[PDB]
Design a protein around this ligand. Structure first.
Ligand code: MG
Ligand code: MG
Ligand code: MG
Ligand code: MG
Ligand code: MG
Ligand code: MG
Ligand code: NA
Ligand code: NA
Lengths: 341, 341, 341, 341
């Protein structure tokens, strides 16, 4: 008889409804349709197609789907972002990172659970672009706050794992006397950094290298930074190369630059902490973030574990801070300002 | 300042939270972890790993993620399905079809929007397995209802586009005198049909062929069916081969078998119908279904368009029915019982 | 041990969380705090208190609660509506009607279920004010559409059950030649109608009487209307007085005014229709509306039942319409344009 | 045109949909219909009406409403709880307390905001009954944990503000040597306590008085307790009588009973703590709880404020604990075990 089944089905597949919507919102941003709708205000599928080189029947399908979900409005003149659609704008970075960057990673979990199946891959270009969008809200303000508490002034900044160069673009626009150098291991991210830096008019003050963090420190680069930023880099080295390699990397920084100020941003691994995991942002962001870090060759550890690593590498903690409680009040994103002990 | 940003962020990325959960639920089913948890009641990660040949640290990560979302419970003895987790069981087919089958298709939409980029691909084995799970609730009862209104009795049943053979297994178990033949174009689905039929003990009464519908009708098969079931097949032929090809296919059926009873199940294309699109199941299922059918080489049309096609092919409508309002009350899934005019 | 209980509790009491939010949104509107925040943009609790004659500590409590839910933002200068708070503006009428008008009614259901316990009461002033706010979106445009399809032009309009007079104020502003008379049985609503009409500068063209519909038609009023609007009035008479009384009331209208055009708006009782009840607006609005009409002395019937009543009363149907599918696509709100047969 | 309005309306009035559902769930429990459906499994409206003395048409309305929301199932034999309906069972106390007890309080906020309008009233009988239901999960296990850490064993227990006597019934059943006395100021709650104690067969070991806490301590009662439980009582005295009155009350306890063990349960006022307020249970429960305590004559203060009050009253802290993180992981419900300094 299946009495009452339909009502249970609508609730039971609610995650599937939102799964498709998240992918569709990701494409709305990534394809530049969102920016086109902002610019035009109202656009017919024919006009959007001509501008972006798209096929009308596929675009009409995406537009009708988004209209049914309330992201778009449709009038005789075309489609427009609704108030709900406009409200998505600040969140672009999260969609680009988690859907663009990590959709393949989540999809690979079934096969990668098998003995010997290896680590899940990701689209590191989208991870970098997306995380840089996110960093405008959380990590860049945190880095700025810690930099203000260091002695002297920043004149030469080195950012390892720079993604598309957003930290360097923001710091260079706010602090005009700064000279900067960024290194990014992903080729696509490296190319996006060279383009963003050129678009912001900063190519004469900021240079980008296609390199990983450990290999950059071992290279014959000619730059004497007084600040080094390691934003979510150490947990990649920890997973890929091991704890002795992280300790040795940190020792090499202060051996080469004994008066340097280090700013390290890391995520505290509280995946098993019942109270922490009930916070709305812990469920929305950190629970999937922790899951991805079990399937990729990265290792998140606790605040106490990082403090032990810093001590073993011969570093002293100047101050520790978390993100503004207006943006992320979980206390899981922690920034450390360190110096040679 | 970003005043109040966090509250907006938690709401803004709610689709991303559910996107990861839908993928994780899909893997919970597809990897056979769900069936393992049902069988064991409580299983430690070590026990689940030994049984399914998995890696403990990756499995613990998936389990902790699902525990944080309330799908699993954790005690000193291990993990178990919660009441919420147990409640997901009937919906397995939807997760397998839409996530397993069509996740790649949704992910390809950005690139496939470009002029000349072609049709998005899918994992047709998972689409078939998943849709067959769904059909237990909606399409198999609808087919059974229409079959009861035809003259005479079914003795020889042909199912084109049979997926994993679920329609044939259910009809053969309910009606022991039936001899059946199924054709499935996807190799993986064909192999799953041969295995399901063997598992149900029906290999002596039901034969499966690896073939598409049009090519099967043109083959030298030796079977005289009195019923032919075309469950969501015609809209594939319509998209791939065109309307004259669908008309010619239907004419060939009644030319070869003039006394045959045809049962056709199709989805009415009401993607642009405001009232229809506000139904909870229209939003949860049909809105993504319509979107997928704009990106794949399949074409959904309206009830009136199908009736015109049937008339042009020389068929008469015996009766038309929709699914039980206990399972799907949208009126979008329509079954037609036809005969030669 | 209560393993996993908290996660189930947060979901289990979600209706309670939203119950308090709905009441708080209702007071935000009803107390004029919403209009104060629109006017001021940012207001400290001291400024809001001085303007509306409120107590600071109670207001701070309401504001902190709403801030926690994302409806308000707080800065050093005070509180303001967030984008989410601003987006609530069009829905004021629904909150005023269902919470202000009918909260007591829903709360009385337990006691009123008992044999001989009578009908639940309501705050008819808030029901009238709120329903008039709603009517701007659905019933006023429907009435306007039907009036345009009548053979005659409206010059003298009678609105029975006029609430706060919003139909008359809108029609009179749009159609300057109209003279109008409204009757409202609730004293509080009647007083709000006299005030709204005076505020809109329409007291010379619109008169309001404190009276129920049946008693108004039996009174010595001196007005010769060519249009009468009965917007959700007949189902009140049907419940309170019975079907013969509704038939007699309609017969009396066309006996007194044989050339009159009648516009009747009613809600189709589809409470037991599985497909209709899965529409998002059916669940949000019509399911509680049907419930309240089982506990108050009002009786909702079906479209066909109304058409039969009209035939018995000697009325002919000119045309029937439902609301615009941009505002309400359920087809449950129906308007009938009638004349004497 | 109101383009796209309906989609915004369905979301905008979601709090109203859940507001009516919460009230309907409250009555389902409070009227004993929930227990009737558990006992019968399937019940026709006629059978439920005969058993509880209800009117069939009003009951059918409530049942149809709940069926539409998925709480009930309907078959030819009658109505039954669905799996979703069954899952509500543990949450009865929250509905009884917040809806039964405090619905009137929330509804009174608009009028009580006015200068000199006084404190909002509540249904203290339902607050007591509901809070006692909740206490089975959080406060009773917390009290039991603290009692076990005292140097003495409990033989004579006094519970001030006992509600319906649930703490005493649970402790007395688990610990057969205990003699107990409870005081409850609300007459309805007092009568429910006398009945619960009689139903559990404990009238020979537990006596209940109709009295407030301060007046009980000033009375001529003849009982020498070695443990006193003050579960959410002190914040009532603090609001109603002031901080000197709370200090004097605590001093009087240890003057009359110098060897007594005191167990105090209080809610930490973190209403203004951004991170704490993003916890799912903080939003669902504590945010409305804080709001109600701004409109009633009760005053919630912080953990540190309570510890300072205890020091002033001449009490020493033996140990402090919060609730089990399986039931409430906010850390806002705190229990203190105290002795005379
Ligand atoms: Mg990482
Ligand atoms: Mg298809
Ligand atoms: Mg009514
Ligand atoms: Mg009634
Ligand atoms: Mg209290
Ligand atoms: Mg108070
Ligand atoms: Na890893
Ligand atoms: Na297609």
């Amino acid at each position: 008889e299946n009495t009452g089944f339909e009502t249970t089905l609508i609730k039971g597949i609610e995650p599937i409804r939102q799964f498709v919507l998240a992918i569709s919102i990701y494409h709305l941003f990534d394809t530049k349709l969102f920016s086109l709708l902002i610019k035009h205000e109202v656009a017919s599928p024919e006009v959007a197609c001509n501008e972006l080189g798209m096929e009308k029947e596929k675009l009409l399908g995406l537009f009708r789907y988004l209209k049914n979900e309330g992201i778009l409005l449709e009038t005789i003149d075309g489609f427009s972002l609704s108030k709900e659609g406009h409200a998505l704008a600040p969140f672009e970075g999260w969609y680009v990172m988690l859907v663009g960057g990590y959709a393949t990673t989540f999809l690979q979990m079934g096969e990668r659970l098998q003995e010997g199946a290896g680590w899940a891959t990701r689209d590191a270009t989208k991870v970098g672009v997306g995380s840089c969008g996110i960093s405008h809200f959380d990590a860049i303000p945190l880095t700025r706050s810690l930099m203000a508490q260091a002695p002297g002034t920043c004149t030469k900044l080195l950012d390892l794992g720079c993604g598309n160069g957003r930290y360097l673009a923001e710091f260079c626009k706010a602090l005009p006397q700064i000279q900067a150098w960024g290194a990014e291991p992903d080729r696509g991210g490296f190319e996006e950094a060279v383009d963003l830096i050129e678009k912001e008019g900063l190519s004469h003050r900021v240079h980008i290298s296609h390199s990983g963090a450990v290999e950059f420190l071992d290279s014959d680069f000619d730059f004497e930074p007084d600040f080094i930023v390691l934003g979510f880099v150490l947990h990649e080295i920890l997973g890929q190369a091991g704890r002795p390699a992280v300790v040795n990397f940190l020792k090499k920084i202060v051996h080469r630059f004994p008066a340097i100020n280090l700013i390290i941003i890391e995520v505290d691994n509280q995946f098993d902490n019942a109270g922490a995991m009930r916070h709305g942002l812990a469920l929305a962001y950190y629970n999937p973030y922790y899951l991805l870090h079990c399937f990729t060759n990265q290792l998140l550890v606790q605040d106490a574990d990082w403090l032990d690593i810093f001590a073993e590498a011969g570093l002293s903690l100047v101050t520790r801070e978390t993100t503004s409680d207006q943006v992320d009040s979980t206390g899981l994103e922690i920034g450390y300002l360190l110096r040679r002990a």
